[PDB]
Amino acid sequence: TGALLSAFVQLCHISTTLAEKTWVQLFPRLWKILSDRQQHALAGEISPFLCSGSHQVQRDCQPSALNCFVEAMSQCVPPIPIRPCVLKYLGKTHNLWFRSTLML
Amino acid sequence: MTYIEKRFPEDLELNAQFLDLVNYVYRDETLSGSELTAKLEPAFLSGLRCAQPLIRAKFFEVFDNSMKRRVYERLLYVTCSQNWEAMGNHFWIKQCIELLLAVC
Amino acid sequence: VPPRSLFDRATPGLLKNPEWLISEDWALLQAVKQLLELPLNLTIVSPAHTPNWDLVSDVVNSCSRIYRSSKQCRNRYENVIIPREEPLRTSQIYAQDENATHTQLYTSHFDLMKMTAGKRSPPINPFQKNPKHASVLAESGINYDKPLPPIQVASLRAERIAKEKK
């Protein structure tokens, strides 16, 4: 299996598209295996990371990293805790308009 | 770190040389120097996101061993302890994919 | 400084212009407090949670008064808050001091100006069949008193087209 993952990663490197999708489709898979103790803390600390202050240079990035990260986070089963203010901020600043509206 | 990559982006030779220099600084003589690594975070990140595969590999091999081989630890790291501001309009989530798939 | 290193694996918290209204000021203070960071030094352990000044700006300018949230004001008024928070505390001045009377008086003044503007705005059988409109038609050569049926008008149009063709 080690020969598959290395080449998969080297392939995701060159292509920004169809690699955003890999994160969107793999992060919830990781969330599924995380126990309640880990999931609680991770969801409680993700919002500070969704803000993460000066992590705004992606504001002009077409596939902004925050877009993919919040998409993956919302595509999980139990992700209840997320602030609506941060949701609106991400929707306005980043290209998360309709996703943010659907979540809200 | 500040000027060599700004004024000579096309001449990949001196860029690779500087990246090998910083990789050696990070790899060898660690017991002696550990404060210099604080300011050279942008250099390390740039060398990690460079377009050359060998440089990326030798940077990731040292970026991975610095953390425990546990999915939860790496997730917490990338979510609260790692600052992606120095990356610069980069799709850094592919480095998260690297870190999450290498521990498998 | 402690033996810190941004490259290390330190993973903490595994289990842990118009005047400013006091309302929007407390809103700004809370938005900064909701960034999960302390005002003692605005880069706490888990340094990835840097201060999002644009976020608190967006959260503040949604208050009563005008936007008034440029890159400068957001930092300036927080730096003004820090001294008076380290007198009454901002939370106390919000809960105290006629909690909702300030913004409500501001809005009442706005509505009074609205009504004044809307009020001062401006509000905004002599049958005469003069002979000029009939004389112009008489000069044109058509009788107005006798209504020509559409059939005769169509016949006249056909005759005119025939004359034109010849």
UniProtKB/Swiss-Prot annotation, chain A:
It is found in: Nucleus. It comes from the Eukaryota. Belongs to the PI3/PI4-kinase family. TRA1 subfamily. Adapter protein, which is found in various multiprotein chromatin complexes with histone acetyltransferase activity (HAT), which gives a specific tag for epigenetic transcription activation. Component of the NuA4 histone acetyltransferase complex which is responsible for acetylation of nucleosomal histones H4 and H2A. Plays a central role in MYC transcription activation, and also participates in cell transformation by MYC. Required for p53/TP53-, E2F1- and E2F4-mediated transcription activation. It is linked to Developmental delay with or without dysmorphic facies and autism: An autosomal dominant neurodevelopmental disorder apparent from infancy or early childhood. Some patients present with intellectual disability and renal, cardiac, genitourinary systems, as well as structural brain abnormalities. In some cases, the phenotype is less severe, has no systemic involvement and is characterized by autism spectrum disorder and/or intellectual disability, sometimes associated with epilepsy. Affected individuals manifest variable dysmorphic features. Interacts with MYC, E2F1 and E2F4 transcription factors. Interacts directly with p53/TP53. Interacts with GCN5L2. Component of various HAT complexes. Component of the PCAF complex, at least composed of TADA2L/ADA2, SUPT3H, TADA3L/ADA3, TAF5L/PAF65-beta, TAF6L/PAF65-alpha, TAF10/TAFII30, TAF12/TAFII20, TAF9/TAFII31 and TRRAP. Component of the TFTC-HAT complex, at least composed of TAF5L, TAF6L, TADA3L, SUPT3H/SPT3, TAF2/TAFII150, TAF4/TAFII135, TAF5/TAFII100, GCN5L2/GCN5, TAF10 and TRRAP. This is Transformation/transcription domain-associated protein. The gene is TRRAP.
Curated annotation (Swiss-Prot), chain B:
It comes from the Eukaryota. It is found in: Nucleus. Adapter protein, which is found in various multiprotein chromatin complexes with histone acetyltransferase activity (HAT), which gives a specific tag for epigenetic transcription activation. Component of the NuA4 histone acetyltransferase complex which is responsible for acetylation of nucleosomal histones H4 and H2A. Plays a central role in MYC transcription activation, and also participates in cell transformation by MYC. Required for p53/TP53-, E2F1- and E2F4-mediated transcription activation. Interacts with MYC, E2F1 and E2F4 transcription factors. Interacts directly with p53/TP53. Interacts with GCN5L2. Component of various HAT complexes. Component of the PCAF complex, at least composed of TADA2L/ADA2, SUPT3H, TADA3L/ADA3, TAF5L/PAF65-beta, TAF6L/PAF65-alpha, TAF10/TAFII30, TAF12/TAFII20, TAF9/TAFII31 and TRRAP. Component of the TFTC-HAT complex, at least composed of TAF5L, TAF6L, TADA3L, SUPT3H/SPT3, TAF2/TAFII150, TAF4/TAFII135, TAF5/TAFII100, GCN5L2/GCN5, TAF10 and TRRAP. The PI3K/PI4K domain is required for the recruitment of HAT complexes, and the MYC-dependent transactivation. Although it is strongly related to the PI3/PI4-kinase family, it lacks the typical motifs that constitute the catalytic site of PI3/PI4-kinase proteins, and lacks such activity. Belongs to the PI3/PI4-kinase family. TRA1 subfamily. This is Transformation/transcription domain-associated protein. The lineage of its organism: Eukaryota, Metazoa, Chordata, Craniata, Vertebrata. The chain holds residues 2400 to 2503 of 3859 of the full protein.
UniProtKB/Swiss-Prot annotation, chain C:
Residues 17-81 form the Myb-like domain. Ubiquitously expressed. It is found in: Nucleus. Component of the NuA4 histone acetyltransferase complex which contains the catalytic subunit KAT5/TIP60 and the subunits EP400, TRRAP/PAF400, BRD8/SMAP, EPC1, DMAP1/DNMAP1, RUVBL1/TIP49, RUVBL2, ING3, actin, ACTL6A/BAF53A, MORF4L1/MRG15, MORF4L2/MRGX, MRGBP, YEATS4/GAS41, VPS72/YL1 and MEAF6. May also participate in the formation of NuA4 related complexes which lack the KAT5/TIP60 catalytic subunit, but which include the SWI/SNF related protein SRCAP. The NuA4 complex interacts with MYC and the adenovirus E1A protein. EP400 interacts with TRRAP, RUVBL1 and RUVBL2. Belongs to the SNF2/RAD54 helicase family. SWR1 subfamily. Component of the NuA4 histone acetyltransferase complex which is involved in transcriptional activation of select genes principally by acetylation of nucleosomal histones H4 and H2A. This modification may both alter nucleosome - DNA interactions and promote interaction of the modified histones with other proteins which positively regulate transcription. May be required for transcriptional activation of E2F1 and MYC target genes during cellular proliferation. This is E1A-binding protein p400. It comes from Homo sapiens (Human). The chain holds residues 2312 to 2527 of 3159 of the full protein.
